[PDB]
């Protein structure tokens, strides 16, 4: 009945201005009783209300940032914008937009998926994608594991799907780990019937938007030959 979707720059440098946009459907800020707010959440932390705006153009801001924030709505009624001036590392967070669940009260009934913003002077780097090939060594009972290693990228996030979204059961995409190099890495592993390895193609679709890196990597089985072994 309602959708909201945040978009942002993915990464920006300290001192720059962050510009975020919320695009929504199923309601309009042209209509009585509608308002949208922004709430952020640093990784592993809690929620902080930032700002909100109503159909009548009244705006409210968190005093902890008020000087640096500007919220506005589009004339179409279908988007809201947030600017944060002079960003520093404390502004790295997931940013959510959400509709208020009342015409006058500030709880939030529908939320977007969030957009991650990393404040960093470090360079953008796209990942290498390496196959994790199934073999006897990834097979237990009648199930085989196979995957992709998504290595050495910055900033987060990457997305991984399998067979363009055709394969979803048994998929485990691990959270990224930031390595000492300043680069992230993760693997995505799926478990499938071992009997399927010969007839079913498996492709991991990796997207790293900050570097415009899109890779579709076919993961081919690699059985091992055991020398001098019955």
């Amino acid at each position: 009945q309602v959708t909201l979707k945040e978009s942002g720059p993915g990464i920006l440098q300290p001192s720059q201005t962050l510009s975020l946009t919320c695009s929504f459907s199923g309601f309009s800020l042209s209509t009585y009783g509608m308002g949208v707010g922004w709430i952020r959440q640093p990784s592993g932390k809690g929620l902080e209300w930032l700002a909100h705006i109503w159909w009548d153009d009244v705006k409210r801001y968190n005093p902890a940032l008020k000087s640096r924030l500007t919220i506005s709505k589009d004339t179409s009624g279908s988007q809201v914008f947030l600017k944060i001036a002079s960003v520093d590392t404390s502004d790295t967070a997931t940013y959510y937009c959400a509709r208020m669940g009342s015409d006058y009260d500030v709880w939030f009934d529908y939320w977007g998926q969030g957009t991650l913003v990393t404040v960093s002077a470090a360079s953008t780097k796209g990942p290498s994608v390496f196959p994790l090939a199934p073999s006897s060594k990834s097979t237990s009972g009648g199930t085989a594991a196979l995957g992709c290693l998504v290595k050495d990228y910055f900033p987060e996030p990457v997305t991984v799907s399998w067979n363009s979204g055709a394969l979803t059961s048994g998929v485990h995409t691990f959270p990224a780990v930031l390595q000492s190099s300043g680069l992230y890495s993760l693997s995505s592993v799926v478990t499938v019937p071992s009997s399927s390895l010969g007839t079913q193609t498996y492709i991991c679709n990796v997207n790293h938007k900050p570097s415009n890196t899109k890779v579709d990597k076919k993961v081919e089985p690699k059985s091992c030959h055991h020398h001098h072994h019955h």
Partner: protein, 220 residues
């Protein structure tokens, strides 16, 4: 500002248990004139945005299961789950909207307990493509185990290796309450090529004998 204090910080329960969690505000959220409490509760599942559960302290949002009940008045509020389901693992947040600035509690993390389950173990040598690029990562994948705390041991030529290992766990499964994890040993290509046997072993509180996978470099 109004400070919202949530307790306990975390709890773990089996499917079916009742749970209660508390939210206490530093001032009353009860508006004298209309006798309403200006309090909402949200549920945030792993990897998702928060979802509204309750507003006005006790009014349930459409589509929220009636096993969730909010109660309380003034400063002391409670969210009760009458009988928890496996899908309820989440961080639960309260929020006051009585006065500007609007503030949230620090959350209660709800996790699910289940019977011990041993992992299945899979191992992946470095890909030829990674080797061509100049690196060597050996990946060990532990699937569908419980509890979360599992010990992974790496051996190179029969000797325990701890340096250079990175571990990552998935969030708890919303259906079977298990975990999975990856353990990745990263070496230089030359270092990788200096050794033959690679072993990943998982030890848990299910068994005393480890679940193992091992390969020999070249022996393929």
């Amino acid at each position: 500002d109004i400070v919202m204090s949530q307790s306990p910080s975390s709890l773990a329960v089996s499917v079916g248990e009742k749970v209660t969690m508390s939210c206490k505000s530093s001032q009353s959220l009860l508006y004298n004139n209309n006798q309403k409490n200006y309090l909402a509760w949200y549920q945030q599942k792993p990897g998702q945005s928060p979802k509204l559960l309750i507003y006005w302290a006790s009014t349930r949002e459409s589509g929220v299961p009636d096993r969730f009940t909010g109660s309380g008045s003034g400063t002391d509020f409670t969210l009760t789950i009458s009988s928890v389901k496996a899908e309820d693992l989440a961080v639960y947040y309260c929020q006051q909207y009585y006065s500007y600035p609007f503030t949230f509690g620090s959350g209660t993390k709800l996790e699910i307990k289940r019977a011990d389950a041993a992992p299945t173990v899979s191992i992946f040598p470095p890909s030829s493509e990674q080797l061509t690029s100049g690196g060597a990562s050996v990946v060990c994948f532990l699937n569908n185990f419980y509890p979360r705390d599992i010990n992974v041991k790496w051996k190179i030529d029969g000797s325990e290796r701890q340096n250079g290992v990175l571990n990552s766990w998935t969030d708890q499964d919303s259906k079977d309450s298990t975990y999975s994890m990856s353990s990745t040993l990263t070496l230089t290509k030359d270092e990788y090529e200096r050794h033959n046997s690679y072993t990943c072993e998982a030890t848990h509180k299910t068994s005393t004998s480890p679940i193992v996978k091992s390969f020999n470099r070249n022996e393929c």
